[PDB]
């Protein structure tokens, strides 16, 4: 029942919502919204409204919004603060949905589509006519069909109209069985020209007005262009038809050495899945060209195309258009298991923001903190104008490039939010300041406790201990929320299993699936009910269980991303609650914190190992540190361990039982030194890494900051069967290095870490030959200027080939894109890739 | 409560007791619903007391099928009913004298409430009119008079007397030992007494026969 918005805009003096109603039907109300801001007043007019600082405030109901906007403008020149939520769309949605929004992703119309263009150059250019618009395939999460748009003729190109039956080939490599599955959905209706099929879309657009329009590089290419063109044909006015509000705006975004132009369709939410991938897929590939990401996520590079890029149009259409579907379908395939759309929806309706605002954490949090405070009759302060000034970032230890046999890492649990809580930092919690000594003096516990009554920071900031902070409070809120949903997930999960156990030998009867909440372990009186259950209902339930476990996941991943981004705002000037004194306080604390545990660790480890001065901590990067546990190994002595697991158990036993506890007393003291509010610095073992037992493996090495690799045998309690090669930024899969070469480097590292300098030298040999005889192009470099003489140069002419495929020269084409790389890893690891002609040996004794 | 002359009439004198200050005022307001069909006596506070009016299943059910126009009989049965709750002090009670002097609670709807109203200035100018009432030192005593003769239900001859104090007040003893027996109101308007939408549709279910 309860309704919910779809999109909301502020065209003019009224909000232009767009929602699903009570009956669950899409609509589009208009509202001369009357926003209310606030203003300070004497404790004489005293009401029920206050600012985070406790000052009593007063409401101010405005006629229209512009009436309110200008109030601010005035109040600012005047010199007084204008409290309250100045982003009306936010305020509107807030009043309009004074409750926890439950949405029906079904009723939401998600449209996926891409653009097919042609030109005598290759790379078309949006904001220009020349719309040859080869093809266009739109999608619609409701009808569940693909609406392909073909162009049989026009001014340039013609003939060969798509072949539904002829699914781009068969028994070959020019078909890819594009329509792999389900054909009830492909709807070929191209009318046989562009002059009309370029407009037909509009009539279509109105029959299925897009709510969420994501596709690949749609925010920069398709839409921005698919708007420009039509404009110059049917006129600007008849170009804003892509906007359910006829309305539209442009926003140029400058880049490094170049710049493009983005167009916005009011009343719509464009989520460039690419940008949705960049942000919610923590991998950050080399070049997201979707002829790789796909080959990554779905594990296959397809279409097996053979033709001249840029000119392929004349080539075919039975194989051309077939692309303009698998494309608009592969993007759909990824989201199927990535769920970034579902992620985004679950964020927005939680924030109470425009769904396309998940790309903006400053806003997302602003909303969230706003609503939390609104409920308490508290008034969000006014966003000031601060000068952008940089502040100390994280602490990365300059490691000593070398090799490290055994190593144990200890990462710190969500440090920057935790630091915020422990210290209890917030605009209003600020208590005062103190004679601040050199950061390292605090690190070494030599400076004098900063305060006896306030929670402090290495930078000189003091905060109230007996008083919750707006910010800290909200993070603890979101944090408990992740803990909350995760539990649902775990139970739905555990429930599903109970169901799966009951699928073997189900009762042979006709019945129905039970009405139960999967977020809670089934009671005894359902564990039973379920058995008798029939096998048509169980399978139904197991789906439901999953529908839950999964809904739980997403719902708690967002709470995570939410936490991991707060600091990313709190340090941003545009953020209402931003404050340098506190931006710094947070970081410089995290600074003292890492270096402090670094100490305490070395200190404790030295002792245990009966020595002094040895730096066991080889290096940390922000929140985690890596500890060399070689000496602790020897204490038991290498030769004694049944196998590799034995050692790992040992190193885990230790540091589960000996280190972490030494680590907490370490932090507990720091809590007390800084007279913090509550100790929340929780460092825990992460990865245990080393060389197989009996192996001449180096174990793991470091060549620089955030540049290394380890042979991990266990991560956060989970022991692996086959080691894992964590490889932190050594330039392997480099976008300019042939996959063949790439894989070698990976092997090189593996072998070094496992199986030693000898093995490395063997493989380095195999691959040197294995390289001398590869393919034509593949190893080839690739650049360009404008065009090439009458691929770009090679293709082959069979005049120059003979001479080229005999005068190339892998010598350079190798010791340039493998050897150079390798050199760095091996030098730091203190090894050689090819047995160096010994020297001292000649000094035979 | 109210007894009857075994005829349909009835008499008694009641006085509403007011709270000092900083305490739950002498008037608590609570709304609710009331109907029975299929043995489903459904009687539950209504959230119309708060900014609800929708989480309250009855009101929602009432608007959705707007019954006031497509079955007035039904609406009458499920319409929301307000019951001004206030602490009182039975003065006289010929039919149940035991209540004499004792402190109780009285559920009284619109009518009577609208009576303290016209017990102040605002009712006639020119010659002026009387001041206030319901406080322990200066107020009237409603003489509840019921008349059920060939007419319809209770009557309304009750109108308090004349501005007069309360017997034995200035005494510390009867002072606190008075406010005590008072069920000071706020528990009437709170999340203390509730129960779900399940109760509503178990009660509702079986009218259509499904
Ligand atoms: N409580 C609160 N209200 C705000 C804030 N900023 C803007 N408002 C406006 O205050 C109005 C709500 O006042 P309301 O919360 O209903 O008062 P009560 O109903 O909480 O006394 C909304 O329509 C908002 O547009 C804020 O920071 N806190
Ligand atoms: Zn009601």
User: Measured between alpha carbons, how far is A792 from A230 in angstroms, rounded to an integer?
Assistant: 33
Report which protein residue has its CA nearest ligand 1's atom 4: A84
Q: Which atom of ligand 1 is nearest to the CA of A91?
A: 25
User: Measured between alpha carbons, how far is A437 from A469 in angstroms, rounded to an integer?
Assistant: 26
Residue A17 contacts residue A31 (beta carbons within 8 Å): yes
Q: How far is CA A685 from CA A187, A320, A793, B10, in A?
A: 55, 53, 54, 82
User: Measured between alpha carbons, how far is A298 from A296 in angstroms, rounded to an integer?
Assistant: 6
> For A427, phi and psi rounded to 5 degrees?
-45, -45
Residue B164 contacts residue B13 (beta carbons within 8 Å): no
Cα-to-centroid distance, A379 and ligand 1 (Å): 8
User: Measured between alpha carbons, how far is A223 from A126 in angstroms, rounded to an integer?
Assistant: 9
Helix (H, G, I), strand (E, B) or coil at A453: coil
Q: How far is CA A170 from CA A173, A175, A179, A383, in A?
A: 8, 6, 12, 62
Quickly count: other Cβ atoms within 10 Å of residue B109's Cβ.
11
Q: Which of A381, A377, A373 is nearest to A470 (CA)?
A: A373
Which ligand does the CA of B56 lie closest to? 2
Cα-to-centroid distance, B52 and ligand 1 (Å): 17
Mutate which of A8, A47, A62, A84 for ligand 1? The one with the most ligand atoms within 8 Å of its CB, which is A84
Extents of the domains making up chain B: 1-210
Q: Name residue A68's beta-bridge partners.
A: none
Report which protein residue has its CA nearest ligand 1's atom 10: A36
Residue A478 contacts residue A559 (beta carbons within 8 Å): yes
User: Measured between alpha carbons, how far is A733 from A727 in angstroms, rounded to an integer?
Assistant: 11
Residue A574 token pair: 């545009």
Q: Which of B158, B138, B139 is nearest to B147 (CA)?
A: B158
Report which protein residue has its CA nearest ligand 1's atom 17: A377
The response to whether B135 counts as a known ligand-binding position is: no
Which ligand does the CA of A61 lie closest to? 1
Residue A354 contacts residue A360 (beta carbons within 8 Å): no
Using CA of residue A33, residue A34, residue A37, residue A38, what is the dihedral sign? Answer: negative
Strand-by-strand arrangement of the A146-149 sheet? A114-116, A135-139, A146-149
User: Measured between alpha carbons, how far is A656 from A635 in angstroms, rounded to an integer?
Assistant: 17
Cα-to-centroid distance, A377 and ligand 1 (Å): 7
Residue B15 contacts residue B91 (beta carbons within 8 Å): yes
Which ligand does the CA of A93 lie closest to? 1
Q: How far is CA B202 from CA A1, A816, B210, in A?
A: 19, 79, 12
Cα-to-centroid distance, A57 and ligand 1 (Å): 11
A415-423 and A535-570 are packed helices; what angle lies between their axes, rounded to 10 degrees? Answer: 60
Counting runs of H as helices and runs of E as strands, what totals does chain A give?
A: 23, 24
Residue A294 contacts by C-beta under 8 Å, 6 or more apart in sequence? A300, A301, A302, A330, A333, A334
Q: Which atom of ligand 1 is nearest to the CA of A370?
A: 27
Quickly count: other Cβ atoms within 10 Å of residue B130's Cβ.
13
Cα A749–chain centre separation? 27
Q: Which of B198, B126, B191, B130 is nearest to B164 (CA)?
A: B130
User: Measured between alpha carbons, how far is B140 from B105 in angstroms, rounded to an integer?
Assistant: 17
First to last CA, chain A: 92
Q: Which atom of ligand 1 is nearest to the CA of A59?
A: 10
Give residue for tokens 């609503």. A371
Cα-to-centroid distance, B198 and ligand 2 (Å): 15
Cα-to-centroid distance, B54 and ligand 1 (Å): 21
User: Measured between alpha carbons, how far is A760 from A751 in angstroms, rounded to an integer?
Assistant: 6
Residue A564 contacts by C-beta under 8 Å, 6 or more apart in sequence? A414, A417
Cα-to-centroid distance, A656 and ligand 1 (Å): 50
Stated length of chain A: 845
Helix (H, G, I), strand (E, B) or coil at A541: helix
Q: Name residue B28's beta-bridge partners.
A: B85
Q: Which atom of ligand 1 is nearest to the CA of A376?
A: 1
Eight-state DSSP code of residue A425: -
User: Measured between alpha carbons, how far is A725 from B66 in angstroms, rounded to an integer?
Assistant: 68
Residue A518 contacts by C-beta under 8 Å, 6 or more apart in sequence? A488, A491, A492, A495, A496, A544, A545, A548, A549
Residue A260 contacts residue A272 (beta carbons within 8 Å): no
∠ CA A546-A551-A552, rounded to 5°: 95
Which ligand does the CA of B33 lie closest to? 2
Cα A432–chain centre separation? 38
Quickly count: other Cβ atoms within 10 Å of residue A13's Cβ.
14
**Ramachandran region of residue B10, left (φ > 0), alpha (ψ -120 to 50) or beta?**
left
Which ligand does the CA of A85 lie closest to? 1
User: Measured between alpha carbons, how far is A446 from A444 in angstroms, rounded to an integer?
Assistant: 5
Give residue for tokens 């941003």. A572
Helix (H, G, I), strand (E, B) or coil at B54: coil
Q: Which of A697, A454, A414, A461 is nearest to A563 (CA)?
A: A414
Q: Name residue A39's beta-bridge partners.
A: A58
User: Measured between alpha carbons, how far is A33 from A68 in angstroms, rounded to an integer?
Assistant: 11
Helix (H, G, I), strand (E, B) or coil at A768: helix
Residue B88 token pair: 């009182």
User: Measured between alpha carbons, how far is A600 from A671 in angstroms, rounded to an integer?
Assistant: 14
Residue B103 contacts residue B76 (beta carbons within 8 Å): no
Eight-state DSSP code of residue A158: B
Residue A212 contacts residue A109 (beta carbons within 8 Å): yes
Residue A819 token pair: 């050897």
A361-375 and A340-351 are packed helices; what angle lies between their axes, rounded to 10 degrees? Answer: 40
User: Measured between alpha carbons, how far is A168 from A161 in angstroms, rounded to an integer?
Assistant: 12
A72 sits in which H/E element: helix A65-78
Cα-to-centroid distance, A37 and ligand 1 (Å): 8
Cα-to-centroid distance, A4 and ligand 1 (Å): 20
Residue A492 contacts residue A452 (beta carbons within 8 Å): no
Report which protein residue has its CA nearest ligand 1's atom 18: A377
Write down the CATH number for the domain with range A109-339: 3.30.420.10
Report which protein residue has its CA nearest ligand 1's atom 11: A36
Cα-to-centroid distance, A84 and ligand 1 (Å): 8
Q: Which of A397, A405, A412 is nearest to A660 (CA)?
A: A412
Q: What is the DSSP string of A94-143?
A: HHHT-S-----TTTS-EE--EEE---SSSS--SSSS-----EEEEE-TTT
Pick B1-210's CATH classification: 3.20.10.10, 3.30.565.10, 3.90.198.10, 3.10.450.50: 3.90.198.10
Cα-to-centroid distance, A339 and ligand 2 (Å): 40
Give residue for tokens 């048509």. A536
Q: Which atom of ligand 1 is nearest to the CA of A35?
A: 25
Q: Which of A595, A594, A592, A567 is nearest to A582 (CA)?
A: A567
Which ligand does the CA of B35 lie closest to? 2
User: Measured between alpha carbons, how far is A604 from A611 in angstroms, rounded to an integer?
Assistant: 10
Quickly count: other Cβ atoms within 10 Å of residue A251's Cβ.
8
Residue A187 contacts residue A148 (beta carbons within 8 Å): yes
Q: Which atom of ligand 1 is nearest to the CA of B51?
A: 19
Q: Which of A301, A292, A132 is nearest to A216 (CA)?
A: A292
Give residue for tokens 């258009």. A321
User: Measured between alpha carbons, how far is A381 from A50 in angstroms, rounded to an integer?
Assistant: 10
Q: Name residue B135's beta-bridge partners.
A: B138
User: Measured between alpha carbons, how far is A731 from A754 in angstroms, rounded to an integer?
Assistant: 20
Q: Which atom of ligand 1 is nearest to the CA of A48?
A: 21
Q: Which atom of ligand 1 is nearest to the CA of A379?
A: 27
Helix (H, G, I), strand (E, B) or coil at A217: coil
Residue A709 token pair: 């690799």
Which ligand does the CA of A58 lie closest to? 1
Residue A407 contacts by C-beta under 8 Å, 6 or more apart in sequence? A618, A626, A627, A628, A629, A688, A689, A690, A699, A700, A710
Cα-to-centroid distance, A103 and ligand 1 (Å): 24
> For A580, phi and psi rounded to 5 degrees?
-55, -60
Quickly count: other Cβ atoms within 10 Å of residue A59's Cβ.
14
Extents of the domains making up chain A: 1-108+340-382, 109-339, 383-468+573-729, 469-572, 730-845
Report which protein residue has its CA nearest ligand 1's atom 26: A379
User: Measured between alpha carbons, how far is A436 from A762 in angstroms, rounded to an integer?
Assistant: 58
Q: Which atom of ligand 1 is nearest to the CA of A49?
A: 1
Residue A353 contacts residue A364 (beta carbons within 8 Å): yes
Cα-to-centroid distance, B107 and ligand 2 (Å): 19
Residue A670 contacts by C-beta under 8 Å, 6 or more apart in sequence? A592, A593, A596, A597, A676, A681
Q: Which of A237, A211, A265, A205 is nearest to A27 (CA)?
A: A211
Q: Which of A519, A455, A511 is nearest to A492 (CA)?
A: A519
Report which protein residue has its CA nearest ligand 1's atom 5: A84
Report which protein residue has its CA nearest ligand 1's atom 16: A95
Report which protein residue has its CA nearest ligand 1's atom 27: A379
What does the radius of gyration of chain B's CA atoms come to, in whole angstroms? 20
Which ligand does the CA of B61 lie closest to? 2
Give residue for tokens 């994501």. A214
Method: X-ray
Residue A415 contacts residue A590 (beta carbons within 8 Å): yes
User: Measured between alpha carbons, how far is A396 from A705 in angstroms, rounded to an integer?
Assistant: 7
Mutate which of A8, A15, A36 for ligand 1? The one with the most ligand atoms within 8 Å of its CB, which is A36
Q: What residues line ligand 1, using a CB cutoff of 6 Å? A: A 35-36, 48, 84-85, 91, 95, 370, 373-374, 377-380
User: Measured between alpha carbons, how far is A152 from A320 in angstroms, rounded to an integer?
Assistant: 12
Residue A23 contacts residue A1 (beta carbons within 8 Å): no
- At the fourth CATH level, the homologous superfamily of domain A1-108+340-382 is DNA Polymerase, chain B, domain 1 (3.30.342.10)
Q: Which of A358, A587, A365, A353 is nearest to A474 (CA)?
A: A365
User: Measured between alpha carbons, how far is B111 from B95 in angstroms, rounded to an integer?
Assistant: 23
Q: Name residue A718's beta-bridge partners.
A: A715
This PDB structure is determined at a resolution in Å of: 3.2
Q: Name residue B143's beta-bridge partners.
A: B13
Q: Where are the alpha helices (DSSP H) in A444-523?
A: 470-501
Q: Which atom of ligand 1 is nearest to the CA of A92?
A: 25
Residue A781 contacts by C-beta under 8 Å, 6 or more apart in sequence? A736
Mutate which of A10, A98, A374, A576 for ligand 1? The one with the most ligand atoms within 8 Å of its CB, which is A374
Cα-to-centroid distance, A349 and ligand 2 (Å): 28
Pick A383-468+573-729's CATH classification: 3.90.1600.10, 3.40.640.10, 3.30.365.10, 2.30.110.10: 3.90.1600.10
Residue A275 contacts residue A286 (beta carbons within 8 Å): no
User: Measured between alpha carbons, how far is A546 from A145 in angstroms, rounded to an integer?
Assistant: 26
Report which protein residue has its CA nearest ligand 1's atom 9: A36
User: Measured between alpha carbons, how far is B142 from B135 in angstroms, rounded to an integer?
Assistant: 13
User: Measured between alpha carbons, how far is B85 from B203 in angstroms, rounded to an integer?
Assistant: 27
Stated length of chain B: 210
Q: What is the 3-state secondary structure (H, E, C) of A642-673?
A: CCHHHHHHHHHHCCCCCHHHHHHHHHHHHHHH
> For A98, phi and psi rounded to 5 degrees?
-65, 50
User: Measured between alpha carbons, how far is A744 from A769 in angstroms, rounded to an integer?
Assistant: 12
User: Measured between alpha carbons, how far is A665 from A779 in angstroms, rounded to an integer?
Assistant: 56
User: Measured between alpha carbons, how far is A485 from A487 in angstroms, rounded to an integer?
Assistant: 5
Residue A301 token pair: 């590079």
Write down the CATH number for the domain with range A469-572: 1.10.287.690
Q: Name residue A116's beta-bridge partners.
A: A135
Report which protein residue has its CA nearest ligand 1's atom 14: A377
First to last CA, chain B: 40
Residue A661 contacts residue A611 (beta carbons within 8 Å): no
Residue A226 contacts residue A169 (beta carbons within 8 Å): no
Report which protein residue has its CA nearest ligand 1's atom 19: A377
Mutate which of A58, A65, A85 for ligand 1? The one with the most ligand atoms within 8 Å of its CB, which is A85
Which class in CATH covers the domain with range A730-845?
Answer: mainly alpha
User: Measured between alpha carbons, how far is B194 from A225 in angstroms, rounded to an integer?
Assistant: 58
User: Measured between alpha carbons, how far is A524 from A518 in angstroms, rounded to an integer?
Assistant: 14
User: Measured between alpha carbons, how far is A38 from A456 in angstroms, rounded to an integer?
Assistant: 33
Q: In a 10 Å sphere around its CB, with 0-12 CB exposed, 13-18 middle and 19+ buried, how is residue B93 labelled?
A: buried
Cα A344–chain centre separation? 12
Eight-state DSSP code of residue A477: H
Q: In a 10 Å sphere around its CB, with 0-12 CB exposed, 13-18 middle and 19+ buried, how is residue A207 labelled?
A: exposed
């Amino acid at each position: 029942m309860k309704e919910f918005y779809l999109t909301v805009e502020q065209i003019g003096d009224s909000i232009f919502e767009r929602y699903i109603d009570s009956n669950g039907r899409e609509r589009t109300r208009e509202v001369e919204y009357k926003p209310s801001l606030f203003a300070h007043c004497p404790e004489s007019q005293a009401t029920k409204y206050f600012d985070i600082y406790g000052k009593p405030c007063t409401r101010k109901l405005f006629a229209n919004m512009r009436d309110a906007s200008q109030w601010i403008k005035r109040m600012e020149d005047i010199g007084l603060e204008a409290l309250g939520m100045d982003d009306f769309k936010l305020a509107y949605l807030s009043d309009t949905y004074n409750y926890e929004i439950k949405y029906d992703h079904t009723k939401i119309r998600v449209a996926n589509f891409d653009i097919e263009v042609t030109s005598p150059d290759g790379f078309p250019e949006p904001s220009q006519a020349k719309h040859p618009i080869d093809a266009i395939t739109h999608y619609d999460s409701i009808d569940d069909r693909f609406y392909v748009f073909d162009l049989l003729n026009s001014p340039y190109g013609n003939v060969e109209e798509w072949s539904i039956e002829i699914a781009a080939k068969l028994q070959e490599q020019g078909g890819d069985e594009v329509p792999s599955e389900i054909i009830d959905k492909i709807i070929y209706m191209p009318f046989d020209n562009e002059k009309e099929l370029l407009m037909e879309y509009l009539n279509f657009w109105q029959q299925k007005t897009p709510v969420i329009l994501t596709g690949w590089n749609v925010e920069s290419f398709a839409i921005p262009y698919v708007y420009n063109r039509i404009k110059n044909i049917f006129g600007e006015s008849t170009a804003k038809r892509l906007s359910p509000h006829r309305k539209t705006r442009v926003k140029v975004i400058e880049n490094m050495y170049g710049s493009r132009e983005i167009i916005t369709l009011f009343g719509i939410s464009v989520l460039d899945y690419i940008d949705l991938y960049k942000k919610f897929s923590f991998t950050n590939q080399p070049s997201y060209s979707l002829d790789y990401i796909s080959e990554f996520e779905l594990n296959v590079g397809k279409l097996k195309y053979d033709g001249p890029i840029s000119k392929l149009r004349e080539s075919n259409h039975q194989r051309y258009i077939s692309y303009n579907i698998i494309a608009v379908y592969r993007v759909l395939q990824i989201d199927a298991k990535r769920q970034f759309i579902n992620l985004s929806l679950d964020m927005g309706y939680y924030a109470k923001i425009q769904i396309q605002s998940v790309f903006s954490p400053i806003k997302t949090w602003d909303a969230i903190i706003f609503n939390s405070l609104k409920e308490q009759n508290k008034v969000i302060p006014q966003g000031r104008s601060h000068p952008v000034q940089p502040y100390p970032g994280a602490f990365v230890k300059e490691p000593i490039p070398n090799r490290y046999k055994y190593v144990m890492s200890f990462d710190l649990t969500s440090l920057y939010p935790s630091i915020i809580r422990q210290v209890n930092i917030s605009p209003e919690t600020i208590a005062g300041t103190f004679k601040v000594a050199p950061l390292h003096d605090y690190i070494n516990a030599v400076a004098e406790r900063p305060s006896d009554v306030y929670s402090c920071s290495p930078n000189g900031m003091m905060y109230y201990k007996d008083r919750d902070g707006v910010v800290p409070t909200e993070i603890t809120k979101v944090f408990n929320q992740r803990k909350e949903h995760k539990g649902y997930m775990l139970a739905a999960q555990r429930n599903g299993e109970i169901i799966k156990e009951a699928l073997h030998n189900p009762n042979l009867s006709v019945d129905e699936p039970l009405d139960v909440d999967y977020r809670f372990d089934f009671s005894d009186e359902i564990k039973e009910k379920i058995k008798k259950l029939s096998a048509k209902s169980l399978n139904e339930m197991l789906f439901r269980a999953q529908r839950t476990e999964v809904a739980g996941m997403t719902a708690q991943i967002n709470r995570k991303l939410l936490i991991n981004s707060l600091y990313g705002a709190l340090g941003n000037v545009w953020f209402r609650y931003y404050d340098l004194r506190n931006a710094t306080a947070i970081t410089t604390f995290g600074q003292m914190a890492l270096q402090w545990i670094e100490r305490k660790v070395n200190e404790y480890l030295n002792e245990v190992c009966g020595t002094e001065g040895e730096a066991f901590v080889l290096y940390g990067d922000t929140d985690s540190i890596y500890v060399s546990a070689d000496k602790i190994i020897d204490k038991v002595g290498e030769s004694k361990f049944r196998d590799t697991n034995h050692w790992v158990d040992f190193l885990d036993k230790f540091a589960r039982e000996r280190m972490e506890p030494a680590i907490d007393r370490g932090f507990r003291e720091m809590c007390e030194y800084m007279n913090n509010k509550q100790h929340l610095m929780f460092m825990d073992r992460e990865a245990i890494a080393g060389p197989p037992l009996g192996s001449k493996g180096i174990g793991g090495f470091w060549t620089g900051k955030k540049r290394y690799a380890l042979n991990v045998w266990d991560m956060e309690g989970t022991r692996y069967a086959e080691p894992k090669l964590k490889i932190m930024g050594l330039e392997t899969q480099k976008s300019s290095t042939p996959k063949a070469v790439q894989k070698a480097l990976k092997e090189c590292i593996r072998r070094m870490l496992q199986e030693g300098e000898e093995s490395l030298q063997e493989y380095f040999k195999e691959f040197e030959k294995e390289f001398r005889q590869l393919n034509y192009i593949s190893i080839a470099s690739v650049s360009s200027a404008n065009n090439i003489a009458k691929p770009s140069g090679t293709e082959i002419t069979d005049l120059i080939k003979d001479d080229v495929l005999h005068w190339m020269d892998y010598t350079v084409l190798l010791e340039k894109t493998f050897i150079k790389p390798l050199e760095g890893f091996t030098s730091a690891a203190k090894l050689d890739y090819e047995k160096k002609a010994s020297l001292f040996d000649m000094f035979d004794f | 409560k109210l007894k009857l002359d075994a005829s349909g009439n009835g008499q008694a004198v009641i006085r509403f007791l007011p709270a000092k200050t900083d305490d739950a005022l002498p008037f608590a307001i609570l709304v609710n619903h009331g109907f029975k069909k299929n043995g489903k006596w459904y009687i539950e506070t209504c959230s119309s007391t708060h900014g609800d009016y929708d989480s309250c299943p009855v009101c929602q059910y009432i608007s959705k099928n707007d019954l006031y126009n497509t079955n007035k009989t039904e609406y009458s049965q499920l319409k929301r009913k307000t019951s001004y709750w206030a602490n009182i002090l039975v003065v006289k009670d010929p039919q149940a004298p035991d209540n004499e002097g004792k402190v109780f609670k009285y559920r009284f709807g619109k009518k009577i409430w609208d009576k303290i109203n016209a017990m102040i200035a605002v009712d006639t100018e020119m010659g002026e009119t009387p001041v206030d009432v319901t406080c322990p030192w200066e107020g009237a005593n409603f003489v509840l008079k019921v008349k059920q003769v060939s007419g319809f239900s209770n009557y309304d001859e009750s109108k308090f007397l004349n501005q007069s104090a309360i017997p034995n007040i200035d005494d510390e003893s009867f002072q606190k030992e008075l406010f005590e027996q008072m069920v000071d109101l706020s528990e009437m308007t709170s999340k203390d007494k509730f129960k779900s939408f399940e109760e509503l549709n178990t009660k509702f279910n079986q009218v259509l026969g499904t």
